[PDB]
Every structure is written in structure tokens, then in C-alpha cells.
Amino acid sequence: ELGAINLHALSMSLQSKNLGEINTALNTLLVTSADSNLKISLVKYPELLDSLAILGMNLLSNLSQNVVPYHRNTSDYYYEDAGSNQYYVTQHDKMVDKIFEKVNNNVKQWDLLPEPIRFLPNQFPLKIHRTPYLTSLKKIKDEIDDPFTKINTRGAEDPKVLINDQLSTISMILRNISFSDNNSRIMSRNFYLKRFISDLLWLVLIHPENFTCNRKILNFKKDLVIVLSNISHLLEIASSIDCLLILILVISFGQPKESLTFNEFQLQWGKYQTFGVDILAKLFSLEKPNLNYFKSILLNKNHKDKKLLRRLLNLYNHNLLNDVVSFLFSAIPLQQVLSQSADPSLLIDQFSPVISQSLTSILVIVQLPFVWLSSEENIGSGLLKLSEIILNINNSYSKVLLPSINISCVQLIKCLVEKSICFENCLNNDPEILKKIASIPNLFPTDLEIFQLFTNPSVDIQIINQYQLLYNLKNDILTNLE
């Protein structure tokens, strides 16, 4: 609303008392919500973010430890005195006191600021919470009215819900802060913020029950993936755990039911399943020898951290990243190719290309004991018909069309050849594969289409080469089949 001017509320937030925390947190949340003219600039801000992450870490911690803060019987919790000193004592003379002490009767370590993040003793990894968007109805069922709602829609008559909603509000305001330049202020350097993200993840998914309303869990997942969307730079300090966490977070969406495990999402409900692949591209483009490499180790099937990692993979039971493939294969098809026109496509088209980009990128990362193939009466590939659509569009938004179709073709050829050569190297399957490969209606654009293409547009040279080499591999497969 109004009033509500200053920024320095951070001070009060930094303070460790329930009162100040409420007073600020609620206000500043309402603030960052308002945007008509209300934005949080950056001058000497950062202190805000620090304070925030510190607060969240401590609260979530002693929550996991199941102990209420803000109220004990200790206070001003260290030394209090006015002893024998003016300014400089505790030299040699101090031992005299010992002497004194021996005749009158007739060093420390200090912890760092935040607490540890993982290895927490009570918190030991047991598989829970790998459930899909379905829980919304759970949420409904939870939020459903019933003689036992236990939704204290009012304030904290008990501190548990207090901590819950506290963290909730913190998450929300954190989201709202994250919609501008000053993403650079958030850019992977608020080591505090990253610690917060990490441990929050490690809880929300490995969540021994302390969260009241599942809807709170949804909120957390949701604004979390959003604020991720507004990151386009490094992550994954103490990576591996965090990398797997983020993967499970994005996998949260899409309906499950070898073959593809994911019914493609009927695009009229959700918009987060978007954010998922959005991030899995953006925050994954960095070919720096860390992130890509973490997921590469995730191909496999302090030091205790490593124990954790495999500890979850077998606690997700073969391979798993096929699930990531299937997930990536959602939201593209079966609606635009089933519409009445190609214009309403362009909207979600804008969204589409990053997906194929992510896919082909991960296919640079698959070149060892596996069984993988993903064209088995599961998708076919309307990619060809889609390419034709965008082509006809070309000769009849923008700036994304040509790259989309190009990378679609590249995707096709690369996945084909990689499948073939992989099951060649293993050679655990009959040459029927060729015949199998030769048995796709969604495949190998007809040579007549190639020909007529070779004439009209004349504005697609690179694409012409794409189709050219594609058809080349096609004819090769035909020949060497016999």
C-alpha cells in the first residue's frame, strides 16, 4: 500500500528477535509486490540479501532440528561484568591471581556465521516427495474444508506454522526481488543466497514432516523455480547434490504414467513446466567444466557427500536421465500440429527452441552399459511436419524460426546416428534395428519434397544442406541395409 518508504529495514531484519523480523518481513514483502512505481534499486542494498539468506538458513535449520527460536530463558547471552580492568589487563599479573587464588582459600574455537548445510545428523536421506503436479488436488484435498482442516487460517497459535509462513513469505519476497537487473546482484555471488537455495532444496525434497500445508510446498517449488528463471549464470557450489536437486525440481512437473514415461502436457493449464526447461537450458548453457560435468557424473549408475549422491540414485529405483529426455519432450507437439492454424503457434514457438537446444546439447553428452533408444511408437517425430509448417510460414514472432527448424533437423540426424552407433558398439541387438529404423512414417522427408524445396525458397542454403545430409544418411541406410 502506502507509507512504507525506507530501505534500511534490513537492520531490524538483521536483528535476532521475532518482533523486528515480523515488522520488516511483512512490510518489505508488500513493498516488493507493488510495482506500479515501486522497485528495489541497488546502491548499498547487498546487506539486505545477506540478512535474508542468513535468516532463512537459521530458521530452516532449527526447524529441521524441530526447535522453536525467539524465546528462551537465556539472554544477552555472553559475559556481563565490570571487573578489575581499565583498558589493558591479562598480562603476566594474571598468574598472580592464580597465586592469589591459591591463597585466598585459607583458546576457544568460534564457529562460522551460518550452520552447516548437509550431513545434519537427524536429516538422513530417505526417499520421499518425488511426486508430480498431481499434488495440487492433494492440495485441494488438503485445503478442502473438513471438520479437521487444521488450517489455522489465523495467526500462530503455535510456533510451527509461524516458522512455516515465515519461510514462505521470505521465499515470496525473494521471488519478487528477482525481476530486474540486480539479477547481477543476485548473480551467483551471494554465497549466502546459494547456501540458502541449497539447503532449502535439500529439505523440500528430503522433507521429514514439519511443513503444514502442502500448498506451502507448492508455493516453495513454484517461486523457487521462478527465481531460478531469473538466473542466467553460474550455480552449483558443492554442486553434485545441488545439481541432482535442481533436476528433481524441474522433473516435478509433467504427468508420468521401456518407453517415454511422460504424457506430453496438454498446454492449457500450466506455465511452470515452461520455467523448468527454461532454466535447464539457461543455467545449463555454461559449458564450463563444472555444470555439464556434474550432470555427466550424473550419468553414472566432506567425503560423505559422495556417499549421499549414489545413495539417492539407487534411492531412485537402468538409467534415469531418460526421464529428463521424456520431460524435455513435453509441451512441444500434439496441440499446435493439431490446431486449425500455425499463427497461434508462434507464441509457444518463441518458447520452443530452447528445448530442442537443451536436448541436442545433452546429446553432446552421450557419445558403457546402457539400453537406450527413444523412437519406439512413443513420439514418432512430427518434427518433420513442424519443420514443413515453419517453412511454409517462411515463404508466406520472428528471429527464431530458421534456427528452430535447423536445430530440429540436426537433432533428428544426431539422435538417429547416435542410437545406431551406440547399439552397434554394444551390438546387443539384431540388425533388425536398421529395418526398425527404416520403419518410421515420421521420418526421412520424401525426395520429391527435397526436389521441390531445392527450387522455390532459395533462401535457406544452410537448411538445404541440413536436409541434404539428412537425405544422404537416409539413402545410405537404405543401401547398406541389404
Binding site: 515480523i22 489465523r154 513469505t169 539457461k282 530452447v354
Partner: protein, 140 residues
Amino acid sequence: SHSNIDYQTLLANSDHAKFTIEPGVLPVGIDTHTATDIYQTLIALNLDTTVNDCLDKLLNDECTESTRENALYDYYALQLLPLQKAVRGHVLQFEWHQNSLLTNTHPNFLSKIRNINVQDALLTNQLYKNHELLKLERKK
């Protein structure tokens, strides 16, 4: 035949979704406000009785100046009671206010990105190209 009076059978059935009632069951015991308010009143009634009691007791000087002082402090505290109740309510509402963190409402939180705009996609591509180019250069 009849007796000016109707009755109920025992063989009918239920839609299981009825909306009819009847005072043939005697759930007499409609006791919500009555008992509540009489309890409330009785509180202050017996209170005032105690007030008058201690008052007269301390007034009767023939009683010991070791019983009196008791009754005097008693009347003090009793006549003071509403004050403590009031300031109690003050501080109570005050602390209760702390447990309010907008659970009451559920505003939108600026879920702006309906789609990721052009800038997102082209940014992905640009980052990829720049990164691979720096890679190519790293040995140059």
C-alpha cells in the same frame, strides 16, 4: 381409527440427502447462549458479593487488625482487576500481532514471465556461441 395424533413408522428408506426435521425426537437441551450468559453473569455476581463481604468485614472494626489488612488489600486488588484485564488485553493484542504474516491473503507475486521472451532464447544461443568461440580461442 385416529387419536388426534400422528406417529412414525420404522420401514421407510432414505434418499440419504434429506432436508426435513421433526420435534418427535426430544433433543431438548438447546443450551448455548443461556448457559453461557448465566455463567458470565454469575461470575460478576459472586464477584460483587465477595466485594461487599470483604468491605463490611474490614469495616467492622471489632475484627482484628490482622484480618482487616487482608481485606483491604483484597478490595484493592478487586477494584483494580479491570485495569489489569485491560492492559493485559493491550499487550496481548500486541504480541498476537506478531503472529500475522499475510497468511490472511494470497496476493500474486509478479509471475511476470508468461512466456520467456525473445531475449531469453536469443540469449541462450548467444551465450552458447560466445562460449564455444572462447573455447576455440583458448588454444589460440
